Design a binder for these strands. Structure first.
Ligand SMILES: Nc1ncnc2c1ncn2[C@@H]1O[C@H](COP(=O)(O)O)[C@@H](O)[C@H]1O
Ligand SMILES: [Zn+2]
Length: 180
DNA sequence: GTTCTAGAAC
DNA sequence: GTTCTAGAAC
C-alpha cells in the first residue's frame, strides 16, 4: 500500500482531526488515544514533525518540556476531580511515527488492553518516564535506549500496584479491579 | 499500532 | 470444549 496510508502513519491523520483533539496551542496538540489502554489516555504531539525520539536533539528540549507541562494541564482540566494517578512517558521503541507523549491513568481499565505487549509496554522499563527523557536530552544531547527492550515485552505479567504475578491477561484484568 | 483466528494451553 | 495467546497481514 501507500506510505501515507500505512498504519504506522496514523497519528499524522488523527492529530489533525478536530473530533480527536482536546487541546491545541502554538506548539502542540493533544488527542485522545484511539485505542485507550486506561480510563484516560491521551497523546501529546508537536505540530512539527519529528519521527521518533531517535531524532530528538537539544533544539527540542524546550518542546519536550512543554509537551510534559501540557500533559499535566490536560490531567487537571479533564480529570482533576478524579484524583487518579497518571504517568507521562514514551515507549522505548514506538510503533507509530511522529513523536508522541503518552499521558495515561494507572487504572488500566480498558477493553483495548488485550495482550502482554500492551501490559509490559506501560509497566516495565520499556516505558520511559517523560522526566527521564527530558533529563537525558539535556545532559547527553540525545536519547539512547539499552539493548533488551524487546525481551521486556515478554516478561511474566505482574501487577503494577502490588507486584502480584498473574498467569494471564484476563486474570490480570480481573485483579486490577481490586486496586480501584 | 490493530484484526483475525489457528491451535496451544488450560 | 473453552479460553487464551501469538503471528500473518501481498
Ligand atoms: N490512528 C490512530 N489514532 C490515534 N491513536 C492511535 C492510532 N493508532 C494507534 N494509536 C495509539 O497510539 C499509540 C502508539 O503507541 P506507540 O507507537 O507504541 O507509542 C498507542 O497507544 C495506540 O493505541
Ligand atoms: Zn495488585
Amino acid at each position: 500500500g501507500s506510505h501515507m496510508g500505512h498504519w504506522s502513519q496514523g497519528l499524522k491523520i488523527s492529530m489533525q482531526d478536530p473530533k480527536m483533539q482536546v487541546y491545541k496551542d502554538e506548539q502542540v496538540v493533544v488527542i485522545k488515544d484511539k485505542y485507550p489502554k486506561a480510563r484516560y489516555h491521551w497523546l501529546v504531539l508537536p505540530w512539527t514533525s519529528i519521527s521518533s525520539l531517535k531524532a530528538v536533539a537539544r533544539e527540542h528540549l524546550e518542546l519536550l518540556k512543554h509537551m510534559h507541562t501540557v500533559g499535566e494541564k490536560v490531567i487537571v482540566d479533564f480529570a482533576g476531580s478524579s484524583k487518579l494517578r497518571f504517568r507521562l512517558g514514551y515507549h522505548a521503541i514506538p510503533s507509530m511515527s511522529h513523536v508522541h507523549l503518552h499521558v495515561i491513568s494507572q487504572d488500566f481499565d480498558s477493553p483495548c488492553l488485550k495482550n502482554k505487549k500492551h501490559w509490559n509496554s506501560f509497566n516495565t522499563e520499556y516505558f520511559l518516564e517523560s522526566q527521564a527523557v527530558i533529563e537525558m536530552v539535556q545532559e547527553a544531547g540525545r536519547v539512547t535506549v539499552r539493548d533488551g527492550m524487546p525481551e521486556l515485552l515478554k516478561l511474566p505479567l505482574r501487577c503494577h500496584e502490588c507486584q502480584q504475578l498473574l498467569p494471564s491477561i484476563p486474570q490480570l484484568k480481573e485483579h486490577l479491579r481490586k486496586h480501584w
